[PDB]
Design a protein around this ligand. Structure first.
Ligand SMILES: Nc1ncnc2c1ncn2[C@@H]1O[C@H](COP(=O)(O)OP(=O)(O)OP(O)(O)=S)[C@@H](O)[C@H]1O
Ligand SMILES: Nc1ncnc2c1ncn2[C@@H]1O[C@H](COP(=O)(O)OP(=O)(O)OP(O)(O)=S)[C@@H](O)[C@H]1O
Lengths: 150, 228, 359, 239, 380
């Protein structure tokens, strides 16, 4: 009925406290992208790290991985990689962000965004596959740093 | 602080003539191009209103059967000089059975471009482009309020003369033809005017040793514009 | 249902705002301070927590400071608190109050609104879009990044409603109003013009978002006074100071400036350039239609005897202003209460017409 | 005599008195004029009469010939001088060439006089702006206006006097070819334009026409009243 | 709601939680130090006339009290107690303790700028030669005393500016005052007009006091016509105090031990009523002037006022510049802002060309009856 009413924001933050929110998101997300993504994921990401305790934030991150896995503009999923620190995500976002060919620039804030673990796990599973070898070029070292200094 | 109107400058020039050279700049543009086939010439009318009937504004007026002209800025100061220049060319053909050449016309005009004074008033406010075909081939001539008369091969005046002279020196050379120069002029026109270029904005005036008189009625202008 | 929890926690934050030994520390600050707290005057400040002050007789002392109050509230030309026994800086004194401010700042809701102006409708939207809509609605200008128009000159023949327009802007407002008639910039002492100008705009820039309305400024040039020093060679310097104060240095700020003249041709055009003043608005003698609104509104609150026609009065003078209309609409009432009446007949307007116009 | 130059150029390229004497035109009475194809019409608004006096002397529309008609704005005395000189000139043209005087000639004369008047030694420029409507040979209606600069300048409808911008804006959204189809409608078009101008009580609406094979007829202000009445009837028929 | 109630709960939880420390812990941030400042001294300041020989034996006028012969204390240096020096003197035993900077007349203290108004060099484009010359004078010796020494010259220690009003003088000054790096000191020309005779002279004295104390500084003069331009002499005795102020400005500027590391910028609107003692170089060397931006200047100033505003970029700017033959940058700014204001008449987010044409015929052709420069181009 609130998908009929179409004003989210308050219905969403009410229906957080009843995963329920998982089937709520994949049930709700068909057409409107930036209201749920920007509005819901902004206010509920910020208020979820702000006021809400940790274990429901994993449901935010996984079902947001679902609907953002449906969606484009991948740094939403890369900030999901910031809070998740998941290794499947970088493989999915490199087959998907190689599927969307800027490029070295998301290499740059990829390497800035990533922690110590996932560029070595990334360079070992991409040492296996690599699909063009340019992600072995970018996403270990030396190509965050080759455009900048000149 | 009102000084005498016939005062030079602390730097040297004058005042009122310099202010006349400033007063040219508000006027409408005009472009004339000398070509050995003949002299072509163009102007903008600057139509303001739709109530303003367009075919009545004169920019190209007729001095002789072979000496053309175009005016700028103030209209009516130019009208006096056009009338008088005609009279003096008629005096020359009368007392000499021959055609007063265009340089002699413009010498006769800039003899009293500055006779401005209180006895025997202000300086005139018009820049003039003079063409025609004398015995020395085609001629294109340009004067000023200060009487400093010079020959110009393709001079552009008035409000858009900076880019007109620059982009004109881009396209011009010595061995141009007529129609190439005509469309080369009106390209510059519809880069320097403000309104859409159409049948009513501009008017041409071309005089040739072959096309003996300057003749330019309407709707060959349509044929020239649709050639763009 | 956020009202309950929001109110409980907000009242807790408000009671913790009042929840900011300790009484022993207050008594110790009172022990450091003397009871006869003497007042001094700063001249300079030395950065080593002791500076120079100046007593009321002229004696001056290098004295330390009881540093808990913000000493950086103080500049040269400030008022401090000092001791008798050691002359030390007890602390800051709040500022003296405030004859220039109380004189030059209109405090009150100052008369009627746009329901009283007689049929302008185009000048009104210009001053609206220059002062009211910028200040009260500062959201459109962010969209285009365009700075608001700075200055507005009202001008026209006398009687057209410059003063009304200023009062109507001062009615519907949200800013501090500052009114100085321009004829108060002519002083019988030398060098008193720039002092008034710098104090005026100091008040404006220090207090608030503001509207400085400077009325009848054209009389500063065309009125020489015997009660003066050397006239034009001081008046010109005063105008030059007003000029530099209006569009000089250092990030002008949130100060609106509206000026009103009768004649405009006797003005030094250096004020009248844009960058200072962007809108110049003509006030003509209106028509024979908005006169009906003027007579209507100036007869809207009276027991008008309906045996009169206002079109008899519109035709009367060919160049009457709202001044003449107010004058007749009040003089007819003065004729009415001369003979203990309430309603106003036609001959009242006739006598009022023959009293206002032709005398 | 008076050896001085009154009108000096500006430091930024103007004639002060030519551009500034247009203001005296700008603060005068309004007058419009259109041409239909067979009947010409013009008239002035804002007589601003005292409603109780003579009116045969304040006539702002006169004629120079049996072919040509006047109108003006600005101050009336300079118009009186220019009209006297124009009458002399048109009749002296009739002295020579045996035609009726062409309108283009008399407009060139007025503008030429005005320019050599502004040019000369110490003569104050004429702060008027005339309208010269006539229909010369083979019945061609034409109408020109003047300017204190001295630029005869052919139009199709008028915009001078007080608030001429508003009047030309109404003529702008009223340039219908249909309006110059019915002579009566052209008269009513002048009445509606002047009605979109000042009070237009039907008192200061002084209008005169010429059907190009006759002389000027000044209309009696009862016919203009019925014209305004049928204009108000069509305005009611608009709703 | 959830952010509001949860932020209220969290912030007031921190507040009411530190309330336990507020009601449990029972100014003194300096109290023991201030009571150790109770063995300090009141230290009344004075003025020294002269010294004596073979011994200190110093002589002091206090300010009003009397004049006393004193001796120095033991915690002083016997050297820097020279004459005319405001020193702090003991109240009881009358002995000198510390020399200090002199009297600065605090109504002159408030014209040092103390801030930096944000005006960049990009805002005066289209005046390249003027920017070049004024850069050459003002910026280069304070940042690079290299070419000026290794070739053996002296840079021109004074630069005057003029032109029509609203041409960029004030704006260029502020552009320098952004990147000045020096002690930039503003002076309005009306600051030197006081009630009493020869008082503005003392103001100029204190200006050059501050100038000589702090090396490598800038002083900006502004509208120097009030300071004094002509010495019209009649049997009336009129404008004279202004004239003495102007002469005192002359002498302490340049002549008989010149100025030091100070540069003076003046700026007037009418550089024609000036006494040629100022026109002598050595005081006012480079005559940098601002004419009107001729053709490309106005294109560039349209690029300046247009680069950060909501317009339709499909239009041109050259046609706009071609309709503004004698116009200042202020009129350009009014054109841009007024075109925006015509866009506010409708409800749009982008300008049109017609909006700018309305702006041109709104500003230039309408208010050209005032226009501020048909009688300042002649420099009346
Ligand atoms: N347009 C108007 N409509 C109604 N009343 C008006 C109008 N213009 C003036 N008034 C009357 O005039 C009074 C205001 O005087 P102003 O016209 O503002 O005088 P003023 O001529 O502006 O004085 P100045 O500014 O020194 S010339 C009001 O009390 C009104 O009664
Ligand atoms: N050449 C220019 N380029 C860009 N903006 C300019 C230019 N000239 C003036 N302006 C703008 O218009 C404003 C007015 O210039 P100012 O220098 O402040 O005038 P001014 O120097 O006070 O002239 P006065 O009245 O003689 S002191 C500047 O602050 C700029 O915003």
């Amino acid at each position: 009925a609130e998908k009929v009413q179409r004003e989210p924001l308050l219905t969403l933050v009410k229906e957080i406290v009843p995963l329920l929110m998982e089937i709520e998101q994949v049930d709700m997300l068909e057409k409107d992208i930036d209201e749920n993504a920007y509005a819901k994921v902004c206010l509920y990401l910020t208020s979820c790290v702000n006021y809400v305790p940790e274990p429901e934030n994993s449901a935010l991150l996984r079902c947001a991985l679902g609907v953002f896995r449906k969606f484009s503009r991948f740094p939403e999923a890369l900030r999901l990689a910031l809070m998740l620190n998941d290794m499947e995500l970088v493989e999915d976002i490199f087959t998907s962000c190689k599927d969307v060919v800027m490029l070295g620039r998301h290499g740059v804030f990829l390497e800035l965004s990533e922690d110590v673990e996932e560029y070595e796990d990334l360079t070992e599973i991409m040492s296996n596959v690599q699909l063009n070898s340019n992600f072995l070029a970018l996403a270990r070292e030396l190509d965050i740093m080759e455009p900048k200094v000149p | 602080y009102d000084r005498g109107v016939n005062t030079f400058s602390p730097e040297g020039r004058l005042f009122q003539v310099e202010y006349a050279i400033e007063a040219i700049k508000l006027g409408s543009t005009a472009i004339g191009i000398q070509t050995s086939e003949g002299v072509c010439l163009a102007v903008e009318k600057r139509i303001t209103s739709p109530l303003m009937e367009p075919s009545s504004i004169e920019k190209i007026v007729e001095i002789d059967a072979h000496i053309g002209c175009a005016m700028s800025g103030l209209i009516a100061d130019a009208k006096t000089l056009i009338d008088k220049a005609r009279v003096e060319t008629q005096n020359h053909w009368f007392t000499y059975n021959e055609t007063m050449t265009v340089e002699s016309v413009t010498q006769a005009v800039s003899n009293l471009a500055l006779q401005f004074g209180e006895e025997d008033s202000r300086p005139f406010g018009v820049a003039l482009l003079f063409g025609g075909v004398d015995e020395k081939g085609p001629q294109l001539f340009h004067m000023d309020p200060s009487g400093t008369f010079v020959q110009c091969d393709a001079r552009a005046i008035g409000s858009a003369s900076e880019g007109a002279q620059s982009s004109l020196q881009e396209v011009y050379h010595k061995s141009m033809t007529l129609k190439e120069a005509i469309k080369s002029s009106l390209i510059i026109l519809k880069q320097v005017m403000e309104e859409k270029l159409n049948a009513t904005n501009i008017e041409l005036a071309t005089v040739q040793p072959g096309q003996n008189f300057h003749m330019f009625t309407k709707e060959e202008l349509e044929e020239v514009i649709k050639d763009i | 249902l956020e009202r309950i929890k929001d109110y409980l926690l907000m009242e807790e934050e408000f009671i913790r705002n009042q929840e900011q030994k300790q009484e022993e520390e207050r008594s110790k600050v009172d022990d450091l301070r003397g009871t006869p707290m003497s007042v001094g005057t700063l001249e300079e400040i030395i950065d080593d927590n002791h500076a120079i002050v100046s007593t009321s007789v002229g004696s001056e002392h290098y004295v330390s400071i009881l540093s808990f109050v913000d000493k950086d509230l103080l500049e040269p030309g400030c008022s401090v608190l000092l001791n008798h026994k050691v002359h030390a800086v007890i602390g800051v004194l709040m500022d003296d109050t405030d004859p220039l401010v109380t004189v030059m700042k209109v405090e009150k809701a100052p008369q009627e609104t746009y329901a009283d102006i007689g049929g302008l409708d185009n000048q009104i939207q210009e001053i609206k879009e220059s002062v009211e809509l910028p200040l009260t609605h500062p959201e459109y200008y962010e969209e285009m990044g365009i700075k608001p128009p700075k200055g507005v000159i009202l001008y026209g023949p006398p009687g057209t409603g410059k003063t009304l327009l200023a009062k109507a802007v001062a009615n519907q407002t949200s800013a501090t109003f500052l009114r100085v008639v321009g004829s108060e910039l002519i002083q019988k002492y030398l060098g008193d013009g720039p002092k008034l100008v710098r104090e005026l705009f100091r008040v404006a820039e220090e207090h608030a978002p503001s509207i400085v309305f400077i009325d009848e400024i054209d009389a500063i040039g065309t009125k020489r006074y015997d009660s003066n020093s050397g006239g034009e060679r001081e008046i010109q310097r005063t105008m030059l100071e007003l000029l530099n104060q209006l569009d000089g240095f250092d990030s002008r700020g949130d100060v609106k400036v509206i000026m009103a003249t009768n004649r405009i041709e006797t003005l030094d055009p250096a004020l009248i350039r844009p960058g200072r003043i962007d809108r110049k608005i003509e006030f003509p003698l209106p028509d024979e239609k908005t006169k009906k609104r003027i007579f209507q509104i100036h007869t809207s609150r009276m027991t008008l005897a309906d045996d009169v026609t206002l079109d008899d009065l519109i035709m009367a003078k060919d160049d009457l202003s709202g001044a003449d209309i107010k004058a007749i609409c009040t003089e007819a009432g003065l004729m009415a209460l001369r003979e203990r009446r309430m309603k106003v007949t036609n001959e009242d307007f006739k006598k009022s017409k023959e009293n206002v116009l032709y005398k | 005599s008076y050896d001085r130059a009154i009108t000096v150029f500006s430091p930024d390229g103007h004639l002060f008195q030519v551009e500034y004497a247009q203001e005296a035109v700008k603060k005068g009475s309004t007058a419009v004029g259109v041409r239909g194809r067979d009947i010409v019409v013009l008239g002035v608004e804002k007589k601003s009469v005292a409603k109780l006096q003579d009116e045969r002397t304040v006539r702002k529309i006169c004629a120079l010939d049996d072919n040509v008609c006047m109108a003006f704005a600005g101050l009336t005395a300079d118009a009186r001088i220019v009209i006297n000189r124009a009458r002399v000139e048109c009749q002296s043209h009739r002295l020579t060439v045996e035609d009726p005087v062409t309108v283009e000639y008399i407009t060139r004369y007025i503008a030429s006089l005005k320019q050599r008047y502004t040019q000369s030694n110490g003569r104050r420029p004429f702060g008027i702006s005339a309208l010269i409507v006539g229909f010369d040979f083979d019945g061609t209606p034409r109408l020109y206006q003047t300017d204190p600069s001295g630029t005869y300048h052919a139009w199709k409808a008028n915009a001078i006097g007080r608030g001429a911008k508003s009047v030309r804006e109404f003529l702008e959204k009223n340039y219908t070819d249909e309006a110059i189809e019915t002579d009566d409608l052209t008269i009513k078009l002048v009445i509606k334009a002047l009605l979109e101008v000042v009070q237009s009580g039907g008192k200061n609406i002084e209008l005169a026409v010429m059907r190009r094979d006759q002389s000027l007829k000044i209309l009696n202000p009862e016919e203009i009243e019925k014209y305004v009445a049928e204009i108000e009837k069509e305005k009611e028929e608009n709703e | 709601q959830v952010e509001d109630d949860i932020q209220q709960l969290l912030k007031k939880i921190n507040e009411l939680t530190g309330i336990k420390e507020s009601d449990t812990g029972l100014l003194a941030a300096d109290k023991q130090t201030l009571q150790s400042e109770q063995p300090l001294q009141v230290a009344r300041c004075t003025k020294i006339i002269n010294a004596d020989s073979e011994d200190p034996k110093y002589i002091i006028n206090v300010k009003q009290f009397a004049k006393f012969v004193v001796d120095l204390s033991d915690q002083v240096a016997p050297t820097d107690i020279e004459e005319g020096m405001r020193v702090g003197v003991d109240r009881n035993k009358y002995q000198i303790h510390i020399p200090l900077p002199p009297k600065i007349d605090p109504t002159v203290t408030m014209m040092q700028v103390e801030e930096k108004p944000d005006v960049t060099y990009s805002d005066v484009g289209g005046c390249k030669e003027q920017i070049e010359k004024l850069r050459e004078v003002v910026e280069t010796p304070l940042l690079h005393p290299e070419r000026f020494v290794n070739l053996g010259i002296e840079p021109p220690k004074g630069v005057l500016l003029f032109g029509p009003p609203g041409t960029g003088k004030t704006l260029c000054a502020r552009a320098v005052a952004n990147r000045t790096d020096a002690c930039f000191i503003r002076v309005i020309g009306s600051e030197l007009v006081q009630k009493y005779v020869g008082e503005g002279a003392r103001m100029v004295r204190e200006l050059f006091e501050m100038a000589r104390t702090k090396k490598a500084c800038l002083i900006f003069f502004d509208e120097i016509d009030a300071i004094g331009g002509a010495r019209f002499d009649d049997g009336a005795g009129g404008d004279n105090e202004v004239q003495r102020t102007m002469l005192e400005l002359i002498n302490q500027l340049d002549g008989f031990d010149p100025r030091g590391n100070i540069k003076v910028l003046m700026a007037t609107n009418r550089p024609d009523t000036l006494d040629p003692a100022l026109m002598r170089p050595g005081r006012l060397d480079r005559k940098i002037e601002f004419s009107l931006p001729d053709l490309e200047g106005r294109t560039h100033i349209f690029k300046i006022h247009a680069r950060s505003m909501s317009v339709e970029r499909d239009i041109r700017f050259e046609l706009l510049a071609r309709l503004c033959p004698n116009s200042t940058g202020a009129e350009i700014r009014s054109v841009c802002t007024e075109a925006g204001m015509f866009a506010i008449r409708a409800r749009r987010k982008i300008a049109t060309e017609k909006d700018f044409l309305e702006a041109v015929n709104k500003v230039i052709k309408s208010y050209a009856k005032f226009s501020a420069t048909p009688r300042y181009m002649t420099y009346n």
